[PDB]
């Protein structure tokens, strides 16, 4: 992925929160035009630019366009995040200010990965072995050969393996499974609501199972009603585990699947 390329940038921090990005900018002196790069948490293949100006943090999403280039909303396209940052060191072109000085990862600090990122490589290896039945040669060549296609596919299906995803079960069945055992606030699962890629969130709140529709928009972006848009369910779950953002509370412990 571009994220693997972006690891060679000393000011790329991987998947950190907005708040963690801001903490790093303070560490680096919060000087005008101080910036770092990180991974977009809701745009698949996306990045985010965090910049200090007037002792405030300014955050910009860098989207991966359909042709595979990189752009901030209403901006020009670039071959890479590195090229976008270089361009913005010479032209503000819509940003609050010039990108003056990168804030590098302090020593000890690597780019941060989420749960998806930590199982992505294993799932790609497994899919090649057990759908193209290689055990050597292409086993490794086929992975690198077809990395972009495999990353995109594994991104769209990696939820199916995750402990909070309970598959094609009804509202009534989901309520039954959440209500069994410990009544921990935020206990949750996601279920498939049809075959057209609609989903639902089931969330325990003061002993009541709340149900939230997760709908697919024109682009195939997922959201709860009036909520932030995500490319994948694993992005949505990471977000609402961090910030309630219109849910009555944050997601906590994944509901156990029938063993």
Q: Which residues bind Cl ion (CB under 5 A)?
A: 17-18
Smallest distance from Cl ion to CB 41, Å: 5
CB atoms within 10 A of CB 96: 15
CB nearer to Cl ion: pick between 39 and 174: 39
CB nearer to Cl ion: pick between 17 and 156: 17
Smallest distance from Cl ion to CB 21, Å: 8
CB nearer to Cl ion: pick between 17 and 185: 17
Smallest distance from Cl ion to CB 240, Å: 11
Smallest distance from Cl ion to CB 17, Å: 4
Smallest distance from Cl ion to CB 18, Å: 4
Which residues neighbour 99 within 8 Å (Cβ) at sequence distance 6 or greater? 33, 35, 49, 51, 85, 88, 89
β pairing state of 34-39 and 101-102? parallel
CB nearer to Cl ion: pick between 28 and 114: 114
Q: What is the Cα–Cα distance from 34 to 130, expressed in whole angstroms?
A: 47
Q: What is the Cα–Cα distance from 148 to 168, expressed in whole angstroms?
A: 29
Smallest distance from Cl ion to CB 251, Å: 15
CA dihedral sign, ordered 112, 116, 119, 120? negative
Distance from the first to the final alpha carbon of the chain: 35
Q: What is the Cα–Cα distance from 164 to 177, expressed in whole angstroms?
A: 12
Burial of 72-91, coded b for 16+ CB within 10 Å and e otherwise, reads beebeebebbbebbeebeee
CB nearer to Cl ion: pick between 48 and 124: 48
Helix ranges, 32-157 (H): 81-88, 115-129, 138-145, 147-157
Residue number closest to Cl ion, CB atom: 18
CB nearer to Cl ion: pick between 3 and 177: 3
Q: What is the Cα–Cα distance from 34 to 11, expressed in whole angstroms?
A: 11
CB nearer to Cl ion: pick between 21 and 154: 21
Q: Please check whether residue 76 is in contact with residue 63, taking contact to mean a CB–CB distance below 8 angstroms.
A: no
Smallest distance from Cl ion to CB 169, Å: 30
Q: Which residues pair with 247 in a beta bridge?
A: 245
């Amino acid at each position: 992925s571009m994220a693997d390329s972006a690891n060679h940038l000393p000011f790329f921090f991987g998947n950190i929160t907005r708040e963690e990005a801001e903490d790093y900018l303070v560490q680096g002196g919060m000087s005008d035009g101080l910036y770092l790069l990180r991974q977009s948490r809701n745009y698949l293949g996306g990045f985010a630019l965090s910049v200090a100006h007037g002792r405030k943090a300014h955050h910009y999403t860098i989207e991966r366009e359909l042709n595979g280039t990189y752009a901030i909303a209403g901006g020009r396209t670039h071959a890479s995040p590195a090229d976008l940052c270089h361009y913005h060191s010479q032209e503000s072109d819509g940003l609050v200010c010039l990108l003056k000085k990168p804030f590098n990862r302090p020593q000890g600090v690597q780019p941060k990965t989420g749960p998806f990122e930590d199982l992505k490589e294993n799932l790609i290896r497994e899919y090649v072995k057990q759908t193209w039945n290689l055990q050597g040669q292409a086993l490794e060549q086929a992975i690198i050969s077809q990395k972009p296609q495999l990353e995109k596919l594994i991104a769209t299906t990696a939820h199916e393996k995750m402990p909070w995803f309970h598959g094609k079960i009804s509202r009534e069945e989901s309520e039954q499974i959440v209500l069994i055992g410990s009544k921990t606030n935020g206990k949750f699962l996601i279920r498939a609501r049809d075959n057209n890629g609609s989903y639902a969130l089931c969330l325990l709140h003061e002993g009541k199972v709340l149900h939230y529709r997760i709908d697919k928009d024109k682009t195939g972006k997922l959201s709860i009603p009036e909520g932030k848009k995500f490319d994948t369910l694993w992005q949505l779950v990471e977000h609402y585990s961090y910030k309630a953002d219109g849910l009555l509370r944050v997601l906590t412990v994944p509901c156990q699947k029938i063993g």
